[PDB]
Every structure is written in structure tokens, then in C-alpha cells.
């Protein structure tokens, strides 16, 4: 054996130039695509915002046109989903996470268009759903689609191009090169066996992806919290406690996100119509709150800066938290296309700010600034729910640029994964796959 | 498949006991790594104090500079060739092998030899990192607790060993992330599955990084402030720089191995001729650490200065070449100490240089040499060691200029690409593929 190794070692890191080139095209496409998707979700959330003003006089008329306009989008979304591609529904990550394990199919001739358009509708509607899902999936199906076209064989080209397209997608959705790579090699990839994935080919993809993102949406960040304070050594324990909170809570949320999935399934019983209806119903509830209380609805970003700056009273926070927990479950558990990643970023930010405000009181001698805890807990749910901290932390760090909080950011995120494990928690993305897999090897 | 469904539902559940030892391996590697760091100081200082003590007589100094350092280097190589021949060299391949079970973790030896043998080599002022000494001491600490409290299973043996490996590289660069990333990208078994608790590692690294802080906080290792940004139309300049490090990286890899052979002749394996050639090279440094501080030393002190652009283009090429030499000698002459850090210094200099030529040819890009410095700082770590994702997150943590990330990647990537197509090989892997085929005859 110590013979073969010696041979392999001398042969390490030598991915076929051909794979290293397609990675360059999967990325360029996922990027151009992810951008086009992003631009679309804009034009829509806007055309809507434009019509509320167009009739700004008549109040009830608005609450209606807000609900209607969004309901009509959500519906068109769920339709395309239940009609042509039931995988497009939900997050869209587990489907790719499964596909890497060869346990799921990558029907791109369907998913690409369904996930895309079905997404604009769900996002343009203003629902509480991320973008990762839509682009991480579209990401992969792009990989597979080039893998097939130019045709390429071997478990590598099939795992590689699929994994690079998965990452390049999560990159252009958060403008976070690193976080992309890190997500693949920590969550997406086969968790229990070896797998021939060119980590170098991935980079090439992510980069080519991130450049396209920049070429069109540069000179403006997604989140701006400026340079908050630093974390004195004697204030680190406060981040371990916060980490515990997200730790016990993370799983509880994981239960609700699954339970609601069952429960909500009743209502339409699988009926393409009752579903598409309950769709427009929830998609409308959002197009309305996206007005009466912008915080409760929407993707989640707009409010992160404001929550971190400390512009919400403690009361207003608890509300927004709870209101969100609800709106996020509905939209995601109701099998609508769109990630659940980002909305969890918003939930931690709010639960963090809150913890922050209580801290800033009990400890005047620590000269705290609520903001630190916001940024500490921002990827804490990504850690207690999805149970993939190393990615959560490098994601936040890339969007908030406050590297001096890294120690607290880790202690929080870590403590979270620790308290989530000891309380029966499970990787929310893995469970969803273990259930979509089970159910299949159930209906036999 | 059905099993997968079962496993999935069981993912990420590392035994509370492992998750606790990780906490102790880290605390120890940290306290240790700090103690080592403090020692290498007291020495480089006691020396600097004696040069002044006789500041009048010039030749006397050049001598006492050479002597004082020669006497340290020797005491270093001795402890090495005498009680633990693995302590010699970097010290990473040995742990990288140990994870593959292909090498032994003789801690009852390595800990004390690597440690004291290091203070001697570093205190001497030679061109060698600290990663090696602490990455190794790191692992041997893991194994040492693994044995003491006694723990079985391939996991606890791979985990605690891998956490102590990372916790070490963390307290050596105060870079929590880079640590974790190094394990799960280079140190870990590159061609088969391996039960390593990534969560247990974190706990280690953190506990390690806190100890580092507790003693050396309020002061960074590298301060380059906030340099400019990289306009989209200036990205290609980083691909070209990436190509340079790409063709060069392997060439350096050859010299680092060849010099290892060649230098071996001179002492022929003779514990004495070796220990002598040791103090010889260790003296050459204690002297340059005076006549030309840049050529000698660990490498940090000069990174800020090279980045700020305080060296003329001439002075750079010199320092580059002078270094390439001094770095090969000290590392190829099997002395204890990493080669990681010194490569950080080499990229910084080759970057600044590329930077200055750029700042000329393109006045319309409003460049600032510094950006290229910070871009190429982890470029060697990418063309030589061929582990970019770690190089990049390491620089990013020490330089804190996240707005350069895109250029940092394009450079580092292009490097690994140009190194591959030119037959390059993971310098850490090659050294093991030798350590292994040697133990096979």
C-alpha cells in the first residue's frame, strides 16, 4: 500500500485540462444566468412598487393590488413547479446535494426554465425566500447541461462540473467567491465516501462566475454595516451564550420547517390546483406585508443593515423575529421555489441584535455595541440549522467585512453546532434529502 | 443507497469525548506555540543585545554575530540528528504522512527536540518559518493526549492528530480559519475517505487562538493598512502575475529538493559534518541579520516595508535572489523549521516588483504596487505547495484587505494552473513521497 500512495502523491492535483476548461464555461454561464435572474426579480418587485403608487389615493385598493399583483406571481410560480418539475419546488439545494451522490436526477431540460421563471415569480412576488436555492440549482443544471452537450465521461467530470456549477451559483448569489468553494467542500459534497472532485476546477468556475456578477452589479454591496467595534477578550463568553441560544433553537426551527411541510401538504392534498391556489394565497400575504410591515416580508437583506445599526427598538425586534419565523416557514414549507439560506441570515441578525441590546445593558462596563452580536449571530442559524458553520462564517465575513469579529463569530457559530448536536439537531439540508429519498424508497 | 438515508440522518455526531479532547489539544498547542514564540524572541534579542555590547569593534561584531548564531544553529541540528531525525526539515510532511498512518508520531522525542531544536534555529535568525515547528509540535501534542487518556478508533486518532495539526498552524499565524482550511485541503488524506471531525478541529483551533491572543494581542504580525481596490480592467494584470508564480513555483520546488541532495553530500550523513555545516549556515545568517537584515531573518519584518513600496526596484531583485538562496540553504540543509512563512516573504517581494513595473506601464490604471504585493503573497504557497484556498485565506487574515480577494484568487489560481501544466508537484507531497520511498529500501 505505502507503495501506491507514494505513486499517487507524486500524481496529486492533475485535473484534465478539458475539465479545467469546462469549469470556466459552467461558471461563465451560471454567472451570466444568476445575474439575469437577479435583474429579473428586480424589474418585478419594482413594476409592483410602481403600481402601488399609480393608485396611491385609494387605500383598500392598494392593499388589494398589493395582494393581487403578488398572488398572481406566486401562482404562476407554483404552477410551473407542480406542472413541469416538482423538484424545482422547495430550496433546490438538497436536489443538487443528492445529485452529487447520484441518488437524484438532474433534469435540466426542465429545471433550468422552471426554477428560473418559477423563481422570478416567487421572488418578484416579494415572498420570504432566498436566491441561493434558485441559483445553486440552476447552477448545477448548467453544469450537467454542458457535461451532456460537449459530452464528457468519468465520475469526475460528472461530479466536478456538477459541483463547480453548484458553487459558482452560490457565489453570484452572494458575491462571495470563497463561501462558494467552502460550501461545496463542506456540505454539498458526498459526506460519507470518497469523491473525485477537482477543487481547482471549482475555483476557476467560481471566479469566472464572480467576475460576471461584478461586471454587472459592482460599485454597490449587498450588505453594508461599515466597521463596527472590536470584541474585547473578556466579552467572548457572551458569544458562547448567544451560541447556545441559536444552538437549542436551531433544531426546533428545523422541526417546524419539516412539520409545516407535512401540514401544509394536507391543505392541497397534492392537488395541483389547491396547491397553486394556496400558493397565490401565501404569495399575496407577502405582497401585502411588503407594504404594511416591510420587515416581516421580503427577502431579508434590506433590513439587516438597519437591525445591526440598532435602529429598531427591542420591542419592534421580537415582533419582526416572530413575524418572520412564521412568514419564512410558510413560504419555504409550502414547497415554493427559492432558498431558505438568506432568510435565516436575516433571522440570526435580528436575534443577534436583540441579544446585543440586552447585553449593552447588563454590561455597561464592557462598552458593547449591539451590532457586534448581530454580525456574530448572522450565520448562527446557518450553523444550528444547516449545521455547516465554516461556510456560514466565511459567508458573513465576506458580506460584512468585519474580520475583527471573527473570533466571536466562530465561538458563536461553533457553540451553536455543539448545542444543536447535543439536542438531536440534524443538517436541515440532509434531512430534507433523507426524507425525499426515503419517501421514494417508500412508494414501492 | 438505503444506507445513505440512514447515515444522512446520523451526520455530524462526533462523540462528546473527542469534542472535549480537541479542547485540550488546542489549549496545549496554543500555550506551547506561544511559549515557543516567546523563546525565539528572548534569543534573537539576547543576541541583538550583545552586538551593541561591543558596538565599537566592527570585525568583533561580524564575528560575535556569526558565532552567537552559529552556536545556536549547531545546538539545533545536534538535537535533531542525535535524538530525532524527523524533527529536521519542515515538519509538516511528517504529520501529513502520520495522518495516512504511513509515518510515526514519536512525541516523547519530537516534542522536546522540535521545540528546543527550533528556538535554536529561529533564535539564530535563519530563514525558516514557525509553522513547521508548531504544526509538528501541534500533532505530537494531539498524539500525546490521545495516548495518555487513551482513546481508540481511527477517528480519535485522525481527529486529535488533525486538530492539533491545525491548532498549531493557527497560533503560528493567529489565523483561525487558515488553520481549519489547511487541514481539510492539504494535511488530510488526499486519496481516500477519512473520519476527521471538522467540528472537533474548530474547537481546537479556537481554544488555540484564544491562548495566542491572551499573550500576544493588541499587536498584529503584519500591518499593511487599507490599500486601494482593484478596478475590473486591471484583473488581467493579476492573471499574468499568476502565470509568473506558476512557471517559477515548480523551478523553486526542484531547487528545494536538489539542494537537499547536494547539501547531503557535504556531511555524507555524518552527525558531525552535518552539525558543523549547520552552525556554518546558522552563522551566515546571524551575520546577514546585520549586514543586510532583509536577506536573513524569518521574513515578516520586511513584508510591510516591501508592500508600502519603500525599496527601490533594484534593492528588490537583490533581496529576492539573496532570499531564494538563504531560504534554500536553511531549509534544504535539513534544519528544523517551516518553509511556509519564508515563501510568504518571497511572493511579497516578487509581487512588489511586478507591482512597480505595472505602476509604470499603466499610469492610466492608477495602480499601487502594494496590491500586487498582497496578491502574490500567497502565490508561492499556491505554485509550490499547491494549496491555494489555504494560502489565500491566510493572507486575507493577516493583511485584512478583503477588497483584493478577487485579484488574490486570480493570481493564486493562475499560479496553480501554470504550475500544473509545467509538471509542478505539491512540495509537501513530494517531500513525503520521498520520505516514504526512502523508508522503502
Amino acid at each position, epitope marked *: 500500500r505505502r507503495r501506491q500512495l507514494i505513486r499517487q502523491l507524486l500524481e496529486r492535483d492533475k485535473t484534465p485540462l478539458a475539465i479545467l476548461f469546462m469549469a470556466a464555461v459552467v461558471g461563465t454561464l451560471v454567472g451570466l444566468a444568476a445575474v439575469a435572474f437577479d435583474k429579473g426579480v428586480a424589474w418585478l418587485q419594482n413594476q409592483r412598487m410602481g403600481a402601488l403608487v399609480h393608485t396611491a389615493d385609494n387605500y383598500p385598493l392598494l392593499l388589494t393590488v398589493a395582494f393581487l399583483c403578488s398572488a398572481v406571481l406566486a401562482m404562476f410560480g407554483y404552477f410551473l413547479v407542480r406542472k413541469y418539475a416538482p423538484e424545482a419546488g422547495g430550496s433546490g439545494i438538497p436536489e443538487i446535494e443528492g445529485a452529487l451522490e447520484d441518488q437524484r436526477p438532474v433534469r435540466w431540460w426542465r429545471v433550468l426554465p422552471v426554477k428560473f421563471f418559477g423563481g422570478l415569480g416567487t421572488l418578484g412576488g416579494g415572498m420570504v425566500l432566498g436566491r441561493e436555492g434558485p441559483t445553486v440549482q440552476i447552477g448545477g443544471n448548467i453544469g450537467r447541461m454542458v457535461l451532456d452537450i460537449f459530452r464528457l465521461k468519468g465520475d469526475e467530470a460528472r461530479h466536478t462540473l456538477l459541483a463547480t456549477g453548484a458553487a459558482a451559483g452560490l457565489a453570484a448569489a452572494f458575491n462571495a467567491p470563497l463561501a462558494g468553494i467552502l460550501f461545496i467542500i463542506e456540505e454539498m459534497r458526498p459526506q460519507f465516501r470518497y469523491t473525485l472532485i477537482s477543487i481547482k476546477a471549482v475555483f476557476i468556475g467560481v471566479i469566472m462566475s464572480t467576475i460576471m456578477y461584478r461586471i454587472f452589479n459592482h460599485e454597490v454591496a449587498l450588505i453594508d454595516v461599515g466597521k463596527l*467595534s472590536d470584541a*474585547p*477578550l473578556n466579552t467572548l463568553w457572551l458569544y458562547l451564550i448567544l451560541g447556545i441560544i441559536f444552538g437549542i433553537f436551531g433544531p426546533i426551527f428545523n422541526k417546524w420547517v419539516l412539520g409545516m411541510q407535512d401540514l401544509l401538504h394536507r391543505v392541497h392534498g397534492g392537488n395541483i390546483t389547491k396547491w397553486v391556489l394556496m400558493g397565490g394565497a401565501i404569495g399575496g400575504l407577502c405582497g401585502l406585508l411588503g407594504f404594511v410591515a416591510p420587515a416581516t416580508s421580503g427577502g431579508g437583506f434590506n433590513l439587516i443593515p438597519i437591525a445591526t445599526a*440598532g435602529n429598531f427598538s427591542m420591542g419592534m425586534l421580537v415582533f419582526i423575529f416572530v413575524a418572520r419565523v412564521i412568514t419564512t416557514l410558510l413560504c419555504f414549507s409550502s414547497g415554493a421555489p427559492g432558498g431558505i439560506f438568506a432568510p435565516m441570515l436575516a433571522l440570526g441578525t435580528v436575534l443577534g441584535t436583540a441579544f446585543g441590546m440586552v447585553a449593552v445593558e447588563l454590561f455597561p462596563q*464592557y*462598552h458593547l*455595541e449591539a451590532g457586534t452580536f448581530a454580525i456574530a449571530g448572522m450565520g448562527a442559524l446557518l450553523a444550528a440549522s444547516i449545521r455547516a458553520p465554516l461556510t456560514g462564517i466565511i459567508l458573513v465575513l465576506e458580506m460584512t467585512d468585519n474580520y475583527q469579529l471573527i473570533l466571536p463569530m466562530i465561538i458563536t457559530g461553533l457553540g451553536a453546532t455543539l448545542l444543536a448536536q447535543f439536542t438531536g439537531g440534524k443538517p436541515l439540508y440532509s434531512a430534507i434529502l433523507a426524507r425525499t429519498l426515503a419517501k421514494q424508497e417508500a412508494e414501492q | 443507497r438505503r444506507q445513505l438515508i440512514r447515515q444522512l440522518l446520523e451526520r455530524d455526531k462526533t462523540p462528546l469525548a473527542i469534542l472535549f479532547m480537541a479542547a485540550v489539544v488546542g489549549t496545549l498547542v496554543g500555550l506551547a506555540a506561544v511559549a515557543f514564540d516567546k523563546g525565539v524572541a528572548w534569543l534573537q534579542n539576547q543576541r541583538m543585545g550583545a552586538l551593541v555590547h561591543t558596538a565599537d569593534n566592527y570585525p568583533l561584531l561580524l564575528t560575535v554575530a556569526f558565532l552567537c548564531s552559529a552556536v545556536l544553529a549547531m545546538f539545533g541540528y545536534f538535537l535533531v540528528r542525535k535524538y530525532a531525525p524527523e524533527a529536521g526539515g519542515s515538519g509538516i510532511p511528517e504529520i501529513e504522512g502520520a495522518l495516512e498512518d504511513q509515518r510515526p508520531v514519536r512525541w516523547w522525542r519530537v516534542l522536546p527536540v522540535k521545540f528546543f531544536g527550533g528556538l535554536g534555529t529561529l533564535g539564530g535568525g535563519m530563514v525558516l518559518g514557525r509553522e513547521g515547528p508548531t504544526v509538528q509540535i501541534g500533532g505530537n501534542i494531539g498524539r500525546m493526549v490521545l495516548d495518555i487518556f487513551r482513546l481508540k478508533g481511527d477517528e480519535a486518532r485522525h481527529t486529535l492528530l488533525a486538530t492539533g495539526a491545525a491548532a498549531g498552524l493557527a497560533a503560528a499565524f493567529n489565523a483561525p480559519l487558515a488553520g481549519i482550511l489547511f487541514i481539510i485541503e492539504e494535511m488530510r488524506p488526499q486519496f481516500r475517505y477519512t473520519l476527521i471531525s471538522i467540528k472537533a478541529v474548530f474547537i481546537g483551533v479556537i481554544m488555540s487562538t484564544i491562548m495566542y491572543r491572551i499573550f500576544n*494581542h*493588541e499587536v498584529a504580525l503584519i500591518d499593511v493598512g487599507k490599500l486601494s481596490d482593484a478596478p475590473l480592467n486591471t484583473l488581467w494584470l493579476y492573471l499574468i502575475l499568476g502565470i509568473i508564480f506558476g512557471i517559477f513555483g515548480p523551478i523553486f520546488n526542484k531547487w528545494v529538493l536538489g539542494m537537499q541532495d547536494l547539501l547531503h553530500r557535504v556531511h555524507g550523513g555524518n552527525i558531525t559534518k552535518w552539525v558543523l555545516m549547520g552552525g556554518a549556515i546558522g552563522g551566515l545568517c546571524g551575520l546577514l541579520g546585520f549586514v543586510a537584515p532583509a536577506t536573513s531573518g524569518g521574513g515578516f519584518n520586511l513584508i510591510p516595508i516591501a508592500t508600502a513600496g519603500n525599496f527601490s526596484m533594484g534593492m528588490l531583485v537583490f533581496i529576492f535572489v539573496a532570499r531564494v538562496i538563504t531560504t534554500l540553504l536553511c531549509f534544504s540543509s535539513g534544519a528544523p523549521g517551516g518553509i511556509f512563512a519564508p515563501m510568504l516573504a518571497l511572493g511579497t517581494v516578487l509581487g512588489t516588483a511586478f507591482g512597480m513595473v505595472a505602476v509604470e506601464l499603466f499610469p492610466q490604471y492608477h495602480l499601487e504596487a502594494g496590491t500586487f504585493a498582497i496578491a502574490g503573497m500567497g502565490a508561492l504557497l499556491a505554485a509550490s505547495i499547491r494549496a491555494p484556498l489555504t494560502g489565500i485565506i491566510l493572507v486575507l487574515e493577516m493583511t485584512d484587505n478583503y477588497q483584493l480577494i478577487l485579484p488574490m484568487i486570480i493570481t493564486g489560481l493562475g499560479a496553480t494552473l501554470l504550475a500544473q501544466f509545467t509538471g509542478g508537484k505539491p512540495l509537501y507531497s513530494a517531500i513525503l513521497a520521498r520520505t516514504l520511498a526512502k523508508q522503502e529500501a
Partner: antibody
Amino acid sequence: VRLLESGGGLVQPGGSLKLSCAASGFDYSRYWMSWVRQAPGKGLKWIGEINPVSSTINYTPSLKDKFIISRDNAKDTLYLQISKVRSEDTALYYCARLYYGYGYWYFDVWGAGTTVTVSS
Amino acid sequence: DIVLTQSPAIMSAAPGDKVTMTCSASSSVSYIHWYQQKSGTSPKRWIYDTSKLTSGVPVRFSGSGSGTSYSLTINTMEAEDAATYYCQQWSSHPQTFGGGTKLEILR
């Protein structure tokens, strides 16, 4: 890094003055500024303090508005407003920068200190 | 608001001579700090975090303690040590200072 304080002088019991501290030598933001005073022939007693962004100001136990502290991050100046002055306000006032090691804040750098005499 | 009580209100020592002074709290405190104050001039941060000396402070100094009693020491105190030392604490809001100790020179 220098910390200049000016504005102290003579005042009538009952009146009010505005002390000023000009900061040179360090990025005045990111810091916490605080005032400490010393009655001739007595120890040091802390008056109050303020952070960067100016969204937090704490004072020692005093009346509803006995003291008003503020800072213009723009002019690199720290002010102190004392009102309804008794003669217990007759003291030497110092401004200071605030920092820490572990996290138990100390008074980093002080200033010469201007004098306030409260008399009729 | 804790109440730190400096020890010898006043006290003189000879040049080259070990000196100690106390700062007994009225409750737990942690990593108290010490300040030096020369007639007519602004306070200086000497010892900080119970023992950690300040960048530039003369090595003859050392300070320690815990819980409720802390102390400053001059291992052979010279003249440029003749001043007034104040201990401060900020382990619990609001911060507080001691009565101060008058280190006068004996000759």
C-alpha cells in the same frame, strides 16, 4: 498623540460653562472619550463618557442634566457642558482616551487638564 | 459603585528599597489599574490589568492582587518614582478611583 482641553476659567455660582478637548495624533473615531475631574486636594472622580458614533453616553450618578457630554467626530473635539454649577464643581477637569487589554477599560491617555473656578 | 481605598495615605522610602502599597476594595474587582501623578502634571498609566506594566514603565515596578486586595510594588524605588499612585477599577460600572498614595522620598 496629544489631548488638549480648554474652556475652564472663572464662573458665577449658578452659571454654566463649556469645556473643550481637541484630539491630535490618532483616528479620533473608533475610540471612546471620557471626562474625569479632580477637586483640589482630593482624588479622581469620573464624570461621564461617550463612544464613537455618539449613540452612547453614560455619566456618574448626577442630576437630570447636571452634565452634558458630546463629541464632534468632525472637528476631532470632545466637549463637556456643566450647568447649575455649585462650588463642588470647582475642580481640575481632564479628558482621556479609553482602551483595554483583557477588557476591563482603563484611562489610556490623559490631557493637561483645564481648571474651573466657581466663585462669585 | 465599588470603593477602592488606597493604603498608606502618605509614606516615604529610601532610594534603592522595596515598596508596597495596597488598594483594598469593598467587594471583588478585577485587573485593577494604577496611575502615577507628579505635582502639576497629568496622570500616567503605570501598571495595568493588575500586573501588566505599561509600555515604557521602569521594570522596578510590579503590581498584583485579586478578589479584594491589590497592591503595587517598587522593587527598589528611586526618586523618579516619588509621586502619587491611584488605583482604578472598572470590573463593575461605574468606574471608580482610590484615595491615592503619596510616595514621598526619605533622606
